[PDB]
Structure formats: C-alpha cells, structure tokens
Design a protein around this ligand. Structure first.
Ligand SMILES: C[C@H](O)c1ccn[nH]1
Ligand SMILES: C[C@H](O)c1ccn[nH]1
Ligand code: NA
Lengths: 301, 300
C-alpha cells in the first residue's frame, strides 16, 4: 500500500550526462552513440541572447570551441550542427553506456521523470507533468540547462524533454530531443510568460481511483452524471474538458474498483462544488493532477 | 526556482539490486562486494511468521538452498550468516558495480531516497522521511521486501534502510543495514502498532525558510516567542518538541533570510492557528515536514 510521487530509476540516463562548455557558458549535454545533444544557446554570450542569429553565430564557431567533459575524460568534438533549438556535437568516442533509447514527443498531461544536473553531474531526480500551458513545475537553479526528462518502457529509455529556460513565474520551458519547443516559447532573452494553466481532469480522476484502491472512500456517493453535464462543471472550475477517450483510458481503474468514470466524476463534481470539508485525500488537501492513469496502474498493481 | 521533493539519482543503487529466493519466497537483496544482504524472514514458511525461531530455521539451511540472481546470472552462495534481522549471503563474485558506500543508522526526521524493487529489478525511486514513530510512509507492494533507502554525498552511497514489512495502518517498517529495526518493531506477524505519529517541527521550519528564499513572505508576522511557549502550543497540534539542537541546526537558514529562528517559530504558531486562508506555500495547502534543513540548503 501507499502512494508516492514516483520517478523512474535514473541509472540508464545518468550514464549519458556530460558537461558542455563553449566560452563562458557551461551546461549539460546528452551523450548517445557518438553525438552530444545540448541546447543551442550554449553558443550565445549575454548580448547574443538578446537577439541571436544562431545560424550565423554557429557558422563562426568551430569544433575546437566546444569542450565536452564526460566525468574525468575530455571528449574531442569532430563535428557540429543544429536541429531546431538543439545543438548536435559529433564526438570521437561512442558512449559505451548508451542505452536502448528513442526520441519521443509527449502531450500535455503526460508525465515524465527529470534528472536535474549541474556541470554534467546528476544531482537529483523528480517526477513532473507537461502542463496544459506547455510548462513544467520543475526545480532548477543556474547551470541546469541541458537536463533531460524521460520515461522507461521496459528496456528502452524514451527521451522526451531537454531543459532550456526558466519563466518569470518560476516555471520552466524546454524542447523535445529534436529541438522543437513545448509551447509558444523561443530561446532568447525577451519578455515571455506562461499562459493561464488549467487542471488535468483525467489525471485527477486517476488519482481519485488511486485513493479508493488505498482505502480512501469518503468522497464516493450514490450519484452519476453525463459527459456533457460534467464538462460544464469542468469549464467553470478551470479544468480541462473530459473526452470520451479519457473515459476509455480510465476503464481499467473503473472495472477494478466498481466505480464508473461518470460515477467518479459525480464525486469530483461534488468535490469541486463543495470542497473537501476539512478532510484530505491521500494526505493532500489539494486535488492532485500529476498522476496519469498509467502511473496509477503501474504503481498500484 | 521551484521546490520539488527530489530523490537522489538511483544509478549507484540499481547496480546492486539482486533477487534472493528461498523455498517459495522471493524478495530483493543488496549486493555489495562479495556479500548479499536481505531480510532474514526470507527463510520463513507459512507456519513460521507468528513465532519464528530464526536460529532453528537457519541451522537447517545449506548454501545451495539460497538462489541469488543478478540480472540473468546466477551467483553461487559460499556462506551465510545472520546479523540481527538481516541475512548476509557470501557469494563467489564481488559486485563489479559496487560504489563507494557506508552504513548509517539515521534518526527520526532524517530523509532518504527509496529504490522500490521487485524480483531484483528496480521499479521506481522516491523521497521519504523517518517519522517520529520510526515508520515510513512509503509505497510498497508484495515482493518489495529488501528494497533499500539511501542518501548519496560526493559519490558515496550511505545505506540507511531496508524494507521488511507493512503495518496494518498502511505504513512501513524496516531495519538499518546492520539488521537493527527502527522503532519497537519485530519481524513477527503478531499484533504491533505504530505509535501516534507527530509532525517533524524542525523540518516544517526549514521548509518555511525555503518559501522565504523562493520569495514568499505572506505568513510572517511581527511577533516572537520563547522556545518553551512555542513548544507548549505546537504539542497541542501533535507537533514534535523543538529542541535547542534544532534551533542550532536552523542557524544558517536564519542567517540567509534574516529571520531569527524564534521569529519563524511565531509565524508557525500563527499558521497552525489560522490555516492558510486559501493560499499555498511552495505549492502545497498543508505544512510539509519531509524536507530537512540540510535538504533545503541543497535544493535552494
Ligand atoms: C535559475 C537559472 O537561471 C535557471 C535556468 C533555467 N532554469 N533555471
Ligand atoms: C502490502 C504488501 O504486502 C507489502 C509487503 C511489504 N510491504 N508491503
Ligand atoms: Na457517485
């Protein structure tokens, strides 16, 4: 029993982290086969960041301008190129600890593990969700750029995030491993802000099912509703609309507990309208929305 | 910015997890050098968990009764001994992935990362704290016995917990890596219940200092308190007594923010009295107590 915010074991990713330095700027890189991936803004000075021409900035750099440190060993850069907002540095040495991996792009509401690093050395791992406004509520300090997010499916690491910047509200923005940003952000020093965020409804329902499996039942009631009736409640309380695909995904938890999804949305409907009334759910006075249905099934079964 | 309950990178511990089987029982073991550590109740049968005589059960065991599996490879057991509540199986091969390590017995209020494991394969990693009643609020299913808790400091892994059992209230009990249980618990299936748990006061205060560091001051007030007056109030909310040691531990966080410890103690007194008024602190609607003073300085 028990329910915790749980991250994937980070060992397969720890063996891929390196330090990348170009001039004054030093950040983290991902070393896979004979290529090191890192944010392209490593090539930018403080003035370059205000309005950078990356293609022109990179055409003036050469291989020797990139110092790549894999622990205690230098890696010699033999090539450099850009894909979107990610810099690809071909190195002379293939990483012997390269795991089976893929580059995947996640959807808002899906979760992943983040390995926070500084100077190519991992310092911590935590779980987070891609918010509907395409930010993540991470914990990063200076030098965290190049930190990566990932999921593990059996033997294969699915890399889905690389950290690029922090927004003025304290949340964070990055790209997939092919350099495409999550959200309407650019890698330069301008006035950027996160849009208004919403709550991931399907994840809240999954978390309520996790509470029922763990013995928390006080919020269940005799009632049920329809998808249209509930989605009116969801929009009023700044929740994401619940779709029929969401109901299908929640199917296993509904069968395993005898609580239909619309049956459970009636509970959530009453929780949104009336509150929790002093009581807690899984040790929380907030409605948790950073557990996917898969997260609940994997941890609770 | 931001504040997450962050675990240590688990890689150095993943390379040490193995599968230990005896009879029909399978659980996890920790493979360091040429020794595999695992809970001694791996040798118990159905008829045994009420009043096991571990000495009598172990004397009937041979080395080849223990099957140790590291990944896909069988390790050959060449010896076995019992130290308190843990079994130590000597194996023919030293673990080539053995990190720098030591064994530490921790105090209530200390935090550590847990690598949850099943059949010697790691499942997930999360952060926990030793509660004042010597239990932990973990996430464990059948087959997780032998999972370990640890901290990492400058590539040295300090192992501080091994999981043994779940109590009827859904919380978990275990030993240090010398086999000594945390708290009054025993590896027996008789009636035993955790004492009434309390809130780790020194951790809440450190977490309040962390909220100030990240730019939030709404919960402060103009008052102070004596140490004894604070403890008279806090214990009425089932908070742990705050000692002069705890006041000393908070010195650095007080100096960085400019808020004396007893002034932050006054703010905590008011928070317990008022609640949060629909506000949050570092993203939570409750007072968090599983960040230590050491943890806050490390993350902030
Ligand atoms: C705090 C530091 O500037 C940073 C960079 C990206 N995230 N956080
Ligand atoms: C509940 C499950 O049987 C378990 C075993 C050890 N911890 N939790
Ligand atoms: Na209902």
């Amino acid at each position: 029993s028990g329910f915790r915010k749980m991250a994937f074991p980070s060992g397969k990713v720890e063996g891929c982290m390196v330090q990348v330095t170009c001039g004054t700027t030093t950040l983290n890189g991902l070393w896979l086969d004979d290529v090191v991936y890192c944010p392209r803004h490593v090539i930018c000075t403080s003035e370059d960041m205000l309005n950078p021409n990356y293609e022109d900035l990179l055409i003036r750099k050469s291989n020797h301008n990139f110092l790549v440190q894999a622990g205690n060993v230098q890696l010699r850069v033999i090539g450099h190129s850009m894909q979107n907002c990610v810099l690809k540095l071909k190195v002379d040495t293939a990483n012997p600890k390269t795991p089976k991996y893929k580059f995947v792009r996640i959807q808002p509401g899906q979760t992943f593990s983040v390995l926070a690093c500084y100077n190519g050395s991992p310092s911590g791992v935590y779980q987070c969700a891609m918010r509907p406004n395409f930010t993540i509520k991470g914990s990063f300090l200076n030098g965290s750029c190049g930190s990566v997010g990932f999921n593990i499916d059996y033997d294969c690491v699915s890399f889905c995030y690389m950290h690029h910047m922090e927004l003025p509200t304290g949340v964070h923005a990055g790209t997939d491993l092919e350099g495409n940003f999550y959200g309407p952000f650019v890698d330069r020093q301008t006035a950027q802000a996160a849009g208004t965020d919403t709550t991931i409804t399907v994840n809240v329902l999954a978390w309520l099912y996790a509470a029922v499996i763990n013995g928390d039942r006080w919020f269940l009631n005799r009632f049920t509703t329809t998808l249209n009736d509930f989605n009116l409640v969801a929009m009023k309380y700044n929740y994401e609309p619940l779709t029929q695909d969401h109901v299908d995904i929640l199917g296993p938890l509904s069968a395993q507990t005898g609580i239909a999804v619309l049956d459970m949305c009636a509970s959530l409907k009453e929780l949104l309208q009336n509150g929790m009334n002093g009581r807690t759910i899984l040790g929380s006075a907030l409605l948790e929305d950073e557990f996917t249905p898969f997260d609940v099934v994997r941890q609770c079964s």
